[PDB]
Design a protein around this nucleic acid. Sequence first.
RNA 1: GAAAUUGUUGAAAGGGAAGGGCAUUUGAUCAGACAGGCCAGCAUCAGUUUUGGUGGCAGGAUAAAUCCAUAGGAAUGUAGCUUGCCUCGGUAAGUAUUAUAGCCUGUGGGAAUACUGCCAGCUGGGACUGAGGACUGCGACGUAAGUCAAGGAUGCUGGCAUAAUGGUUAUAUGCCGCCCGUCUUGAAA
RNA 2: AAGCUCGUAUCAGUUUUAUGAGUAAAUAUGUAAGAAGUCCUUGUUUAAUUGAACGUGGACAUUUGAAUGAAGAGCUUUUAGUGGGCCAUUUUUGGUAAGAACUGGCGAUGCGGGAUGAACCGAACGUAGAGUUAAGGUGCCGGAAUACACGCUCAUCAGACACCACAAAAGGUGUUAGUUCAUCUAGACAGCCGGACGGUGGCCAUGGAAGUCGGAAUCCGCUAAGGAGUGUGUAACAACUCACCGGCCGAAUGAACUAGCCCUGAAAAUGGAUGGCGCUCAAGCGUGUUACCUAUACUCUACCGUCAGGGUUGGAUGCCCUGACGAGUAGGCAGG
RNA 3: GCAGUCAAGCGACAUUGCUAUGUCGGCUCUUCCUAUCAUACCGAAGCAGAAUUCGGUAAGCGUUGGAUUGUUCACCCACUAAUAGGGAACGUGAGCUGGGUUUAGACCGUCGUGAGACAGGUUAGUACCCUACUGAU
RNA 4: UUUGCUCCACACAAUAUAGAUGGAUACGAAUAAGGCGUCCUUGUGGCGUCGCUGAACCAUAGCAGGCUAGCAACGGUGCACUUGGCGGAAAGGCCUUGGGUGCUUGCUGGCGAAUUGCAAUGUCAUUUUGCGUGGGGAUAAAUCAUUUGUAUACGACUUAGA
RNA 5: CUGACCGAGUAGUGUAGUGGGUGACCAUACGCGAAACUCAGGU
Lengths: 227, 170, 188
Amino acid sequence: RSKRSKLVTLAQTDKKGRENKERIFDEVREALDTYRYVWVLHLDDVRTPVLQEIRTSWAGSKLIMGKRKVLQKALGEKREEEYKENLYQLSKLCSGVTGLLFTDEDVNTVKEYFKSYVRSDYSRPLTFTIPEGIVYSRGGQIPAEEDVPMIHSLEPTMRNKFEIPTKIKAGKITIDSPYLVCTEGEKLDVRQALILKQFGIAASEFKVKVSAYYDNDSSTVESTNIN
Amino acid sequence: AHFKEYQVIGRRLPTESVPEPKLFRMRIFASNEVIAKSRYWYFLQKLHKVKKASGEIVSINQINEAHPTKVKNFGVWVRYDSRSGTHNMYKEIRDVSRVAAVETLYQDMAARHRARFRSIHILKVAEIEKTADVKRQYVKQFLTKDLKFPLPHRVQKSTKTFSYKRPSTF
Amino acid sequence: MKYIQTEQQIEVPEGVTVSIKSRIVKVVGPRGTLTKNLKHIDVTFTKVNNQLIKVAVHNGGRKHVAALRTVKSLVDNMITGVTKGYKYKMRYVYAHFPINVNIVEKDGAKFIEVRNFLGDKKIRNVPVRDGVTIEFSTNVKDEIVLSGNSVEDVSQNAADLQQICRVRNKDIRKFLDGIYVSHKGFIT
RNA sequence: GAAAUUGUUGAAAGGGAAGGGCAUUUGAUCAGACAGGCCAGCAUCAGUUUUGGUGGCAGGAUAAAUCCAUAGGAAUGUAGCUUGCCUCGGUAAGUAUUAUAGCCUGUGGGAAUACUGCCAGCUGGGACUGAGGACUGCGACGUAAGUCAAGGAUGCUGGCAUAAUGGUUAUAUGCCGCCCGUCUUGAAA
RNA sequence: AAGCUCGUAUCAGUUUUAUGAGUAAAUAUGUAAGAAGUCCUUGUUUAAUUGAACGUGGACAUUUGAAUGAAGAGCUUUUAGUGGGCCAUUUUUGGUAAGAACUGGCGAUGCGGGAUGAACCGAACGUAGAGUUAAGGUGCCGGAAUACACGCUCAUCAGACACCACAAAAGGUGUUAGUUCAUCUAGACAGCCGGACGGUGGCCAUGGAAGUCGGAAUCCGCUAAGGAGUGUGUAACAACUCACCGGCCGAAUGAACUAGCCCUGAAAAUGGAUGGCGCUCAAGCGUGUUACCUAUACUCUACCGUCAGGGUUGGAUGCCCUGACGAGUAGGCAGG
RNA sequence: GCAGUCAAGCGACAUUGCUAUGUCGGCUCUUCCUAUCAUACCGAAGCAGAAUUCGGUAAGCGUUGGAUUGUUCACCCACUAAUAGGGAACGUGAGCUGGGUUUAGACCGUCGUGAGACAGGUUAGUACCCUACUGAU
RNA sequence: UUUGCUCCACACAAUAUAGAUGGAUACGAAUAAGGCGUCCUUGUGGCGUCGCUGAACCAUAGCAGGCUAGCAACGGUGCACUUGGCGGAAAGGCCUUGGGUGCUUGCUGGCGAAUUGCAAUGUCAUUUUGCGUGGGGAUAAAUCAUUUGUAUACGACUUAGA
RNA sequence: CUGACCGAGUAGUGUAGUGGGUGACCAUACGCGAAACUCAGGU
């Protein structure tokens, strides 16, 4: 009788199930022949608006994403089971969260666009220090005369998770001493990344990267790797 | 003592215009021939229109195990009548013979479900030669290669009522 | 289903070593030693390579499986305490009456002394358990740090410290004065 | 010169009842007979009964098996080989149907054992009963004479010849037992 | 109780054969299973001895008209007690929780078991010896196995054997076993982290209400996915977070339902009882397998008496043999 | 309760309008139950303090003096932390009280021809035995 | 009290036994672990060994256990002494030096058993009590009567008087 | 208006348990055992 209870709620959305994956597999298979060039991109972490802007930043083309294993099945993970000529090699290079941009304009143009495409991103950098007094919404990265004091509602989030020893007397959030949050040139911890994201310090930048390309007439993987 | 397997065939005694019926047969588990025949009659009366007065047992023979010394995974399908409505039940018993499997099944049903002999119906018993098709974990665990386990807390029996050694286990 | 045998793997770092006899267990390492009397749990230990130890229970039920798992968890906790150590940071805040916390050698037991809790004249003495070092935080206002090798002792001391300053006959939604834990990280 | 009731002497018991029934120990008391009275042992017997050993058969699929010969299959894959680092002899996954283990399935071959029933087969040990009182009858072993386990115990031996066995009672203990009559469908009430 | 006439006697609290009686069973209820019966022939109200009726001649004696059992059947005189009984089972009626019809017990009844009991399970009773059982038990009281084997129980009022003085539905994140869906090595769940988007701060009310104080609604563009947003929320925002999706984690997981044991459901007053002691792989529960204890029951034998059948012309109401049996209140007889 | 309402199971929860014919009572006494009035310890409540509501275990203690009913019906004042509910034949007649009920006399109302009765109201009335307990050889 | 008590030695009785007919044979802890011997760099160490019951260990031969002769050991053990110890939970028991006295079945010989007539528990121990002999030690209390009351119905209790 | 392995061995019912279930009720073993109904035929 002793089993974990479920916190499920009567939401307005339900799981798509296996049907969506099967449909995407067929869509990828059809796109493999519909378009000339194929690519295996890496988009492990990107905001949805960035993807939407990418999907409309170029002429008629299809940006295809999905489950990594589903994409491998569509391409085939074995030479004997490969769907197209040497398509197994292309699947072998799919490592992370991959997506395919099916288009036929120019092989050089696509890679040039990938190289030149850069946008702001979070830390998931230069060191930052919180002001020694009242903490503002931006954590002192902008003049206090322009920013606004942090909302007291998020102080429990600061204390319990971010580890900062915040105190609330005159409940406008204040700290007893400046707090170092990030060092110079290091991969921030999950707590540090969350702290930076809350402060809105999007110092990092994201640039799309591609591992390899493919062509319907080349019959082989275009092993071009740029970031 | 142990359960016995008998092949029982009924005749449905013939009469003019009804000659030589199909000679229905059944497999019955019972301790003796009389109980086997009684169970066969009970099943036959329910299955179709026949009665002991208007029928006879063609022949009864004990079904000896083909391989009395061999471990088999017996698949069991049983219908048992509980206090509430009856329902189907599938069980697997690792045993040496069909008789032993049925004997263990009777005890298991009596214990885990309080189902008496009167309320137990043996739908079918089949030896499972395959291994990948075993579905019950408590029998599957015994199929691991080179399975070895200890017997911790061994307890001995003493004839005399008094012991001076203060014995131990293993 | 009365599993024939179930076991869990205990990872012992190269630095520390553990010697096992009847269910009395000893752990030794750079940060001292710890012991526990697991004779009430009825589990079996076995050596593999002096770097991994398996605790196996034969013909054990669901309760026995849980007992084995908690034995594994306790052994892991002992190893972590012997290797890393625990640092239970505690903080106290007050509205009007400044709470005063000090360590006194009354009766030669290093009792912790708390005074002026909400203006109460009564002074509570909390006996400091064995093997739990206590030091006041530096450059951090109204913070005290409790550290020790054993998880149980440090956690019990931290719980006792906060339980002593239990508001009575007052609205907890208004009287924020009290003692609370602020961190549970390792000394390292 | 009775019982109810009371005192002296002798015996016995008595931890909130006594009295009674079956059964025996201890104390007291008591009748009887011995060219054959009381108490027991051994041998072989008639009847009842209880517990063991052991032998020959009647049935099973003429038990099933096991085992043997043959054909085939398989992995909780035997040897060998390939890959892997290498704790250089290790085992991890691929192959490999008997090879440096063996397993299962079908067929055929010679036997026992198990279960079951029979024996108008044999035999050891223990307990109770000795009822009838010259023959007549039914049966068995013997050429016969005769004998016998065949319509109910005989033969030998020892102690005592007395409170030894045994009866009465006092009291010790195993168990049980409610207070008599009438009435009430029912009472100890 | 006294008996009387006949005697192999017709019978039966029972079955079978045949069939009435019933949209209509079963149990019961009715008649028969013939020697006092059947058949050929023939003597003394119809037109006619045509026929009823009772006789004579002739044909069948008993596989003679089914099974089983029968200390025989019928008959006469007279009378002691009760004429209000109680308990239990079936059917019918009544009924939130008793009245008519049936049969067995107690009353009149001992003996073993349920620690005892009038309604229960065995079994009905002479005095004795030996053995086997019934119900009931094999941890002690208590004579018998801390017997064997398979599964369940942690109960802070567990549990511990029909009548017996008795509760369930339902709830439990206690525990054991099963039925059906639903996702699964082209990746099931836990866990980790990333996305969770624009029209739109959708139309109304507004001072603010921007996904969330409210009303009607609830769509378009792109996705692998994203609900005009499941909740937390600052006066609004915002932010956090849910559904959903991506990856790493690497083998079953998740939902409902079913029935075995346990708690609640099942709360009072002197202190208390599975009978007590007492027990937890039970000495509890369900089931299977063996040997054990015995009642006044059964089997073998000794004796008293009652009854019955035979023998006896050489104490006759006398003596011998064989067989069955021994309950009992009111009451009858007989012998003392 | 009446008459509906939908519906997981085989009709639960929720849901629609209104809606005294008896005698027991009191003084003392001992004990027991919790369904806790007060006291101890806690949780939830708009607990800012103070005061207060409910809920959980806990019966040791405390649970009154008075206007007033014979009274069964049962209402008020005041103190106190509070003045909680019950059992022991709704304990307590060889303990008391007979208070009320109930003989023999008598007065008023109804009926009854009458004697009398009440639907009724009033008055006056007859342990020294055993055990248990407390003390003590 | 003309010698009572008590202890020791020795002799007959009664009196019985909740029931002898070789020995109640001494570590502790756990039972998902232990006992024993050994070794080390002494620990929760390494090695070998053992359980699966005491079905064991000790002891056990002689007329209910006689009278005698030798051998080899100098051990085994009953008896009274004797030296030094331990034990207080109900110690009243458990150790050990020294000899003395026996037996020794450790080994080998000499004589006797009979008739209890074929078995009859065939009497072989410990608890209590008194009288019959010898040797050790000393020559007191309570109650009643009276009497004071810290007390009481009476008992009882608290006190004093050669 | 007839036959049938047709309802169906279903409903129902006699007998026994120290059978299950608090109760309502249910199952087992020894037996009996239908009708409406179904197919065809009849008219």
